[PDB]
């Protein structure tokens, strides 16, 4: 079991930072109490997502080196990863360890919330696939951090600067792959695979949106801005 001190430090730091903010209890239990309605579900789901985004900007604001980047690039990294990051969380939430609590009920709200079962089917297929990988909090944390820290996002001016910040996360996740699952591996390769996949999911997501209707309810200001519309 390798893992240098520099690497363990990054991991401990990232892990710390990863579990700080957390979703507000109000919005959370809002899926237990309160009930159905495609429009009510649509509002809850959209309320959380707006939350998630907020938590996400804080997490990446304290990712090693982030504030050191050009200000425009930071925006681009955020706008560029908000959706994909959301996918990773969705994955984390859905598969692995069922605390016999609200999460299985969240799936229900998602089903019939004005979302085409022609979209939820493949999407949930994906989450179940990433599930097969039997990932840990740490793997989810690093993936989220490397997803956010992608030098190949459409508008960044200085990609090397972002690279310097992402490689360390990449080196760690990989070494972490040998450790937890050496039986194969390929696992690290496959993990990076899912990272390319959800990039195409971002595309479908953008399309499913303009057809997402529910009565006439609108998304929150932030979402309209980050999800584009």
């Amino acid at each position: 079991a390798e893992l240098t001190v520099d690497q363990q430090t990054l991991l401990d730091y990232i892990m710390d930072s990863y579990s700080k903010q957390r979703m507000p209890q109000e919005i959370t239990n809002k899926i237990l109490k309160e009930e159905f309605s495609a429009e009510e579900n649509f509002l809850i789901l959209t309320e959380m997502a707006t939350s998630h985004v907020q938590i996400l900007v804080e997490f990446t604001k304290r990712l090693p080196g982030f504030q050191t980047l050009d200000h425009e690039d930071q925006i681009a990294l955020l706008k560029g990863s908000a959706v994909e990051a959301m996918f990773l969380r969705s994955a984390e939430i859905f598969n692995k360890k069922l605390p016999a609590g609200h999460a299985d009920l969240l799936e229900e709200r998602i089903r019939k919330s004005g979302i085409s079962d022609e979209y939820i089917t493949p999407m949930f297929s994906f989450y179940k696939s990433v599930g097969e990988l039997k990932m840990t909090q740490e793997e989810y944390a690093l993936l989220t951090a490397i997803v956010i820290l992608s030098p190949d996002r459409q508008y960044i001016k200085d990609r090397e600067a972002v690279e310097k910040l992402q490689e360390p996360l990449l080196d760690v996740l990989q070494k972490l792959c040998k450790i937890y699952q050496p039986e194969n591996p390929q696992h690290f390769a496959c993990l990076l695979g899912r990272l390319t996949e959800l990039r195409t999911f971002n595309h479908h997501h953008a399309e499913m949106l303009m057809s997402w209707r529910v009565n006439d309810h609108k998304f929150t200001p932030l979402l309209c801005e980050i999800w584009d519309v």
């Binding site: 900007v57 604001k61 932030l222 801005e225």
Partner: peptide, 12 residues
Amino acid sequence: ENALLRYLLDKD
């Protein structure tokens, strides 16, 4: 423009 995002990045 991303005015909201910007605002969340500078003082939250």
